[PDB]
Design a binder for this molecule. Structure first.
Ligand SMILES: Nc1ccn([C@@H]2O[C@H](COP(=O)(O)OP(=O)(O)OP(=O)(O)S)[C@@H](O)[C@H]2O)c(=O)n1
Ligand SMILES: Nc1ccn([C@@H]2O[C@H](COP(=O)(O)OP(=O)(O)OP(=O)(O)S)[C@@H](O)[C@H]2O)c(=O)n1
Ligand SMILES: [Mg+2]
Ligand SMILES: [Mg+2]
Lengths: 195, 196
């Protein structure tokens, strides 16, 4: 079952599959926990006199940084090998929102739920500039946004194409760009050449 | 540990995700066949059942895996609160890099004495994904760091694995990055190195 465990009763798996912990992203996670709490319980197993993390070390670290004293958890009675299988599955079996889906999510918070970009930043735990730049993508033509969504155009390519004044030109330059895997720098030059 | 009947759960028609990759859903389903659902889905009471807040892929993949029930957490929230939760669940995550992933498969094989096929079944990943990831670990240390930080794609790395001698491979890898060579250009340049 999902119970609240004292944060100090939980310790990390020194053999966790993640070895790099990005500081900035851990801070984004902690800000989201200040706003929303921990949405998904961490997985632990009894270990020593407390619990060893199976999956959820970032949540545990970020909860500490947010000043929480307890964390939602599920206690699993599993072997070492199955605990490691679970650690891998938890991280590997996921699909992120694409950039347009993310942007449209912020847009709904702004339009339907009447939040400012700053308020969105606080509720979701993202830098306001991340929210602002995501929303700017939605001004792209439908076909261009589709290319950002399926990854054929990076957010950097899309940002450069936002400079084109004419929507037909934008569409024309985007076709040339993504077709040739043309570089962001070369895309910026093309936009200049167009205007 | 709350399990809800899978038929009592329905999707949020306004969910943030519109695109559902079928290959990735199949992998998710294979992982559920082996491990169950690790992460309870978040739901809210709706009609006579429940509306998903976060967990539509888990719910669809559980159906495909033949489960009759899914672990769930019932949240009593407003619509704006439910939508914020849906966004945060997806946006506040950090993936393992490709070398961290490959080293995980390696530990299952070397330390826990699994076969590659067993790794595939237990983690829900295609046979070839596991094999290709493990092959990355033969790369030199500096080239492995390029894969880890995204400078070299796994497709580039795979072609570079054809280079027989390590000094040539490291030289070629820098050219790939310096010159932003496609995978297919990288293959060309590897093939020539093989001719000598
Ligand atoms: N307020 C929040 C924001 C995010 N999350 C969930 O937190 C997990 C993060 O996923 P990850 O970045 O992989 O970190 P994690 O903890 O699993 O460490 P670890 O063992 O891999 S090193 C994902 O499920 C997110 O929906 C949450 O519950 N509450
Ligand atoms: N056997 C497994 C394999 C994966 N997972 C977790 O399943 C979530 C998938 O994450 P996502 O790909 O975003 O799919 P999801 O369901 O949330 O739909 P949704 O509302 O975004 S559209 C992540 O936490 C994974 O650790 C699990 O619990 N059991
Ligand atoms: Mg994780
Ligand atoms: Mg999700």
């Amino acid at each position: 079952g999902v119970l609240k465990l004292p944060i100090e009763s939980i310790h990390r798996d020194k053999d966790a599959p993640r070895t790099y912990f990005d500081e900035e992203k851990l801070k984004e996670l902690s800000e989201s926990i200040k706003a929303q709490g921990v949405l998904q319980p961490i997985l632990v197993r009894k270990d020593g006199d407390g619990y060893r993390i199976i999956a959820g070390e970032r949540r545990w670290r970020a909860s500490q940084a947010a000043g929480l004293k307890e964390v939602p958890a599920i206690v699993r009675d599993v072997t070492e090998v199955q605990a490691f299988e679970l650690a891998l599955v938890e991280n590997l079996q996921r699909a992120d929102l694409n950039p347009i889906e993310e942007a449209e999510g912020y847009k709904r918070l702004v339009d339907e739920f009447k939040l400012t970009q700053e308020q969105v930043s606080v509720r979701v735990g993202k830098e306001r500039s991340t929210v602002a730049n995501a929303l700017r993508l939605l001004a792209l033509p439908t076909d261009v946004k589709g290319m950002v969504a399926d990854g054929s155009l990076s957010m950097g390519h899309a940002r450069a194409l936002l400079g084109v004044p004419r929507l037909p030109e934008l569409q024309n330059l985007a076709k040339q760009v993504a077709d040739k895997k043309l570089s962001v720098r070369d895309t910026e030059r093309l936009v200049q050449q167009s205007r």
